[PDB]
Design a protein around this nucleic acid. Structure first.
Ligand SMILES: [Mg+2]
Ligand SMILES: [Mg+2]
Ligand SMILES: [Mg+2]
Ligand SMILES: [Mg+2]
Ligand SMILES: [Mg+2]
Ligand SMILES: [Mg+2]
Ligand SMILES: [Mg+2]
Ligand SMILES: [Mg+2]
Ligand SMILES: [Mg+2]
Ligand SMILES: [Mg+2]
Ligand SMILES: [Mg+2]
Ligand SMILES: [Mg+2]
Ligand SMILES: [Mg+2]
Ligand SMILES: [Mg+2]
Ligand SMILES: [Mg+2]
Ligand SMILES: [Mg+2]
Ligand SMILES: [Mg+2]
Ligand SMILES: [Mg+2]
Ligand SMILES: [Mg+2]
Ligand SMILES: [Mg+2]
Ligand SMILES: [Mg+2]
Ligand SMILES: [Mg+2]
Ligand SMILES: [Mg+2]
Ligand SMILES: [Mg+2]
Ligand SMILES: [Mg+2]
Ligand SMILES: [Mg+2]
Ligand SMILES: [Mg+2]
Ligand SMILES: [Mg+2]
Ligand SMILES: [Mg+2]
Ligand SMILES: [Mg+2]
Ligand SMILES: [Mg+2]
Ligand SMILES: [Mg+2]
Ligand SMILES: [Mg+2]
Ligand SMILES: [Mg+2]
Ligand SMILES: [Mg+2]
Ligand SMILES: [Mg+2]
Ligand SMILES: [Mg+2]
Ligand SMILES: [Mg+2]
Ligand SMILES: [Mg+2]
Ligand SMILES: [Mg+2]
Ligand SMILES: [Mg+2]
Ligand SMILES: [Mg+2]
Ligand SMILES: [Mg+2]
Ligand SMILES: [Mg+2]
Ligand SMILES: [Mg+2]
Ligand SMILES: [Mg+2]
Ligand SMILES: [Mg+2]
Ligand SMILES: [Zn+2]
Lengths: 206, 24, 60, 155, 118, 80, 127, 98
RNA sequence: CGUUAGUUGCCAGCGGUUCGGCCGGGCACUCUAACGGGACUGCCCGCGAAAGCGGGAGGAAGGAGGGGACGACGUCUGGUCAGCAUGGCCCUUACGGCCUGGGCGACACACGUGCUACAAUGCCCACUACAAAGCGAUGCCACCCGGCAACGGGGAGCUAAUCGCAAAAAGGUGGGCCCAGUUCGGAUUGGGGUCUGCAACCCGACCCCAUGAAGCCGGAAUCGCUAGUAAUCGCGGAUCAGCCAUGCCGCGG
């Protein structure tokens, strides 16, 4: 029991907040709730599109939600069809009359949560985990990414004994807060039980 | 000592006011 | 906790003293910070995730 | 101190006598971090010793400390089962603290009501060869020369 | 000097000397010394019998005191004891009354520790 | 040391019940789960079953006990 | 004409205004001894003058706020020595060995979780 | 009298929002008092690190609200010309009181 | 230490004064909070092959300056399915669902952690001086009146470097106590009462009267701390209508 969260470590420098706005004593409570309804609802609909981060900004009653997706085409739909359905569904939950933006993510293999999702997807389909891990490390390592690390939690391959897997490559120095280590977590649910997937990507120096 | 509630120091210990420790 | 114990959300408590905090995310009964509406656990989880604006790592 | 020598702290010279031995003694009197209380006790006790006796409280303070300094003490060393009382010399630094501590401890076993009254009288007795602090010193010097049979265990 | 039902404090300050009376604490002594117009710092042995009799006149019948107080309180217990009151039951079994915890540290009320085996 | 400071509280359940019982004469045992309430002078002479959480215990209400609350005579704990 | 130094000790500041004069010292509109004098170490603030024998040369007007009175006395000890160097920078070679111009950076150690007061650990039994 | 109270959790957001306001008013108004910073309201939250004790392992966080003041003296139009809606920053919050 | 910045700051400087930074006024200073500078064994002596060690000057600061955040491959089948998520297995007029009441506070005992003390370097009373960090929109409540008081009425200010919690306590000067189960010690208990709350019997805190216990430095054993440290003193906060907080997390003397 050690190794505190890397993103929670880096929120000050080399990482920003997924929500950037201001509130008061009588405001912050519900505004934070609205942010969690938003990220909650997107992950339901937008999992197939491959979203990575949901960024919610507010100036005054305006909501600047930005979704970073690997395939922005699944988001927009044909001729702007699905960016109509679920974007009006967004202003129905919260009456803030909120507008929506989309952003492309180059190299989905370079976004840690996306790499985690990809591994968990394969685990739900029961592939070889050590290969799926080492394969996942190559997809990250073969494009920039001076470091990479992948962890898979217990019940590996549906084993009765819980295990822990491995195979980082390069350099993943979590102890230093300098070089913008990305982090993501996936959850693979299966018949034998639950599996966690931790993804570490290392890129840049200062 | 601090335990006697009708002494001035026992009043400040609990953080209360009364005849033995007025306000002003 | 239990789904029936989130009856605080529908409160109409019939007495104003029966209202309690009830962390919204996990349904925590016991320890709920009033400013975030989140329990100490949810608060710690959401803070690491960076979904709480302005919340840093206290160090001094 | 397993690594270093554990260098000695350098106390501030006294505000009145400019003497460090006085400031260290005032500290031994201080309890619960009330140094302003301790100094007033020690300095009022200088009035008692300078009036009831017509000498310098500076010289008697030093003269009292010198008489309580033990030249030898005993320490325990594990040898073949149960340990022994082993006499050995006292470090000049240790003679500093021991005499001061004994002087303050002996003065509080005194009968006198007020603190400064006990201090001045104890210092007066200690300077004259009597008093409770000198008894502890003499009793320690009795432990040495008694177990002197173990003088081969010096270490 | 006898003030209340037989009560003889001596040689100390009067205000403190009255605390030796049963129905008198520091509060009622400072009040008697006040309304009687008597210096509280004066020694008991230096008290004028004229200031003594005035103290007696006030204190004797202003509040119920040693004899009557002991009975009144003792009659105040039998009262809540003769009724089936819970507070009286806590007095019967010699246990705390104000609603403390009895699992530990009841020693004052409970007749200090009488140990059993384990 | 006991203080309600004004409007000495008695639950409305038994209050409207006992005063109407006085109009028709002294009645028999009564059901009471409200030990929150105090005792008022017009209760003297009745018999009230107060709940322990388990059982209903008949309590004869007298003059000396007017100042107290129901449940003071209906204890909860069971020891020895 | 006039000379100044700041000085600081343990969350306390003391503005030292040294002017040539009779030697009388003013603190917060009060005499030096009406603020102190019940405080034995008070005289240690004026030691920078006695090292250079500046007792009777200068008056003083001092404004003190922050911390407790003891840290103020040291805060005054530095402000007197800081101004005294601005008057004559040759006074540095005399003032330096005594260390009256050295700031004391010892500050209250922050209280730490798991302990009671920043070092003191809760006692345990093991049985 | 025109007061402008700047508030936000990011100290770089305020200064980026404050300097853009002064560079618009200084081309028109008199000498502006300046970016006078107000102290920070620090709310601290100490939470036990894990659930289900190990009480003595807690870690704490701090949310800091920085504040700023502007005080444009005698602005008329060319100050308010550039002051309608030109600002980029988001995490900032502004108030106005006359 | 400087730069930027001045409605906390100031007869440093004059002007005015109801002598209160109060006004006039100014940013120098204290300060506040953003960016920078600063320390590198760089300089000298000595040792050494080197890394480095010893000492010295200059310096606010030196050999990691002080304190944090940070805890590696793994270990203990460690802890928690009762925060959450969850495989499998059971329950379904019921293990589920509502309510009132009671319990989680029980007491012949034991251990743990703490609080308060056994006192004269102390206690009580009056008087008076010096902190830092936080909290507050029906919440903080100056101030006035009532009341011994808890508190109530009235009511000013404060979206708060501007108003309020607020008094810091030890300390200082003055006075009382004179070694005595007491002017130490505040347990227990009778009685009277404020406040929150639908509601204080189980089972609240607070005030006032009276009661005034054990305890006169603790057996074997055992704990913390190496410098603003231990010891001691008070202050604030989180949760919370209230509060059993002596706990916890911070703050400075
Ligand atoms: Mg596999
Ligand atoms: Mg990094
Ligand atoms: Mg007392
Ligand atoms: Mg569940
Ligand atoms: Mg509640
Ligand atoms: Mg052996
Ligand atoms: Mg209790
Ligand atoms: Mg039996
Ligand atoms: Mg000049
Ligand atoms: Mg600190
Ligand atoms: Mg401390
Ligand atoms: Mg333990
Ligand atoms: Mg804990
Ligand atoms: Mg500066
Ligand atoms: Mg200002
Ligand atoms: Mg000045
Ligand atoms: Mg003029
Ligand atoms: Mg004028
Ligand atoms: Mg004027
Ligand atoms: Mg006036
Ligand atoms: Mg004046
Ligand atoms: Mg005034
Ligand atoms: Mg004006
Ligand atoms: Mg003007
Ligand atoms: Mg060296
Ligand atoms: Mg050096
Ligand atoms: Mg080294
Ligand atoms: Mg360090
Ligand atoms: Mg490191
Ligand atoms: Mg097990
Ligand atoms: Mg385990
Ligand atoms: Mg319990
Ligand atoms: Mg039995
Ligand atoms: Mg104990
Ligand atoms: Mg009045
Ligand atoms: Mg301001
Ligand atoms: Mg102001
Ligand atoms: Mg303002
Ligand atoms: Mg005030
Ligand atoms: Mg005195
Ligand atoms: Mg006894
Ligand atoms: Mg007594
Ligand atoms: Mg005694
Ligand atoms: Mg250490
Ligand atoms: Mg509270
Ligand atoms: Mg209310
Ligand atoms: Mg407290
Ligand atoms: Zn939660």
């Amino acid at each position: 029991g050690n190794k505190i969260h890397p993103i929670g470590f880096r929120l000050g420098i080399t990482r920003d907040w997924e929500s950037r706005w201001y509130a008061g004593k009588k405001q912050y409570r519900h505004l934070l709730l609205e942010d969690q309804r938003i990220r909650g609802l997107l992950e339901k609909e937008l999992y197939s599109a491959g979203l990575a981060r949901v960024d919610i900004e507010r100036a005054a009653d305006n909501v600047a939600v930005t979704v970073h997706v690997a395939k922005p085409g699944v988001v927009i739909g044909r001729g702007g069809e699905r960016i109509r359905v679920l974007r009006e569904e967004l202003a129905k939950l919260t009456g803030k009359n909120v507008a929506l933006n989309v952003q492309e993510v180059q190299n989905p293999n370079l976004s840690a949560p996306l790499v985690a999702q990809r591994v968990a997807e394969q685990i739900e389909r029961r592939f070889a985990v050590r290969r799926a891990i080492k394969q996942a490390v190559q997809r990250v390592m073969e494009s920039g990414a001076k470091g990479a690390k992948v962890i898979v939690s217990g019940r590996i391959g549906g084993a009765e004994q819980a295990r822990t897997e491995w195979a980082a490559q390069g350099r993943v120095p979590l102890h230093t807060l300098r070089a913008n280590i990305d982090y993501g977590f996936a959850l693979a649910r299966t018949t034998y039980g639950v599996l966690g997937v931790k993804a570490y990507i290392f890129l840049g120096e200062v | 000592g601090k335990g006697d509630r009708r002494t001035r120091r026992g009043k400040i210990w609990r953080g209360t006011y009364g005849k033995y420790r007025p306000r002003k | 906790a239990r789904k029936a114990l989130i009856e605080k959300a529908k409160r109409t408590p019939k007495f104003k003293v029966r209202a309690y905090t009830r962390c919204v995310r996990c349904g925590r009964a016991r320890s709920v910070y009033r400013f975030f509406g989140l329990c100490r656990i949810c608060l710690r989880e959401l803070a690491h995730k960076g979904q709480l604006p302005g919340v840093r790592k206290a160090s001094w | 101190a397993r690594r270093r020598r554990a260098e000695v702290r350098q106390l501030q010279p006294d505000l009145v006598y400019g003497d460090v031995l006085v400031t260290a003694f005032i500290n031994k009197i201080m309890r619960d971090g009330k140094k302003n209380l301790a100094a007033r006790i020690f300095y009022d006790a200088c009035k008692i010793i300078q009036e009831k006796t017509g000498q310098e409280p500076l010289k008697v303070f030093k003269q009292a400390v010198e008489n309580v300094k033990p030249r030898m003490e005993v320490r325990s060393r594990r040898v073949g089962g149960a340990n022994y009382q082993v006499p050995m010399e006292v470090s000049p630094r240790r003679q500093q603290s021991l005499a001061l501590r004994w002087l303050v401890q002996a003065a509080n076993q005194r009968p006198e009501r007020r603190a400064a009254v006990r201090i001045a009288h104890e210092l007066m007795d200690a300077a004259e060869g009597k008093g409770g602090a000198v008894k502890k010193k003499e009793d320690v010097e009795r432990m040495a020369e008694a177990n002197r049979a173990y003088a081969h265990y010096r270490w | 000097a006898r003030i209340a039902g037989v009560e003889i404090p001596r040689n100390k300050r009067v205000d403190v000397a009255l605390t030796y009376i049963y129905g008198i604490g520091k509060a009622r002594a400072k009040e008697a010394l006040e309304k009687t117009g008597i210096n509280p710092a004066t020694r008991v042995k230096d008290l004028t019998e004229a200031e003594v009799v005035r103290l007696r006149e006030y204190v004797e019948n202003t509040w119920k005191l040693e004899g009557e107080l002991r009975a009144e309180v003792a009659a105040n217990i039998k009262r809540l004891m003769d009724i089936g009151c819970y507070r009286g039951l806590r007095h019967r079994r010699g246990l705390p009354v104000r609603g403390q915890r009895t699992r530990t540290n009841a020693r004052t009320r409970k007749g200090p520790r009488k140990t059993v085996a384990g | 040391p006991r203080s309600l400071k004004k409007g000495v509280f008695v639950d409305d359940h038994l209050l409207e019940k006992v005063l109407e019982l006085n109009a028709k004469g002294e009645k028999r045992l009564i059901k009471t789960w409200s030990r929150r309430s105090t005792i008022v002078p017009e209760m003297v002479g009745h018999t009230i079953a107060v709940y322990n959480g388990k059982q209903h215990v008949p309590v004869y209400i007298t003059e000396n006990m007017v100042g107290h609350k129901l449940g003071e005579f209906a204890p909860t704990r069971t020891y020895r | 004409e006039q000379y100044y130094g700041t000085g600081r000790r343990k969350e306390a500041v003391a503005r030292v205004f040294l002017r040539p004069g009779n030697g009388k010292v003013t603190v917060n509109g009060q005499d030096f001894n009406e603020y102190f004098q019940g405080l034995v170490r008070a005289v240690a603030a004026l030691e920078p003058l006695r090292a250079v024998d500046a007792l009777g040369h200068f008056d003083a007007y001092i404004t003190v706020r922050g911390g407790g009175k003891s840290g103020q006395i040291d805060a005054i000890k530095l402000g007197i020595a800081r101004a005294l160097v601005q008057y004559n920078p040759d006074y540095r070679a005399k003032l330096k060995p005594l260390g009256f111009l050295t700031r004391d950076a010892r500050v209250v150690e922050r209280k730490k979780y798991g302990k009671h007061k920043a070092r003191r650990a809760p006692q345990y039994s093991k049985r | 009298k025109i007061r402008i109270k700047l508030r936000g959790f990011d100290h770089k957001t305020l200064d980026a929002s404050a300097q853009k306001i002064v560079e618009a008013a200084r081309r028109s108004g008199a000498q502006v008092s300046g970016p006078i910073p107000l102290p920070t309201r620090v709310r601290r939250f100490t939470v036990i690190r894990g659930p289900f004790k190990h009480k003595d392992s807690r870690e704490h966080f701090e949310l800091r609200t920085h504040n700023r003041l502007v005080d444009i003296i005698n602005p008329n139009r060319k100050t308010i010309e550039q002051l309608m809606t030109l600002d980029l920053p988001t995490g900032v919050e502004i108030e106005i009181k006359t």
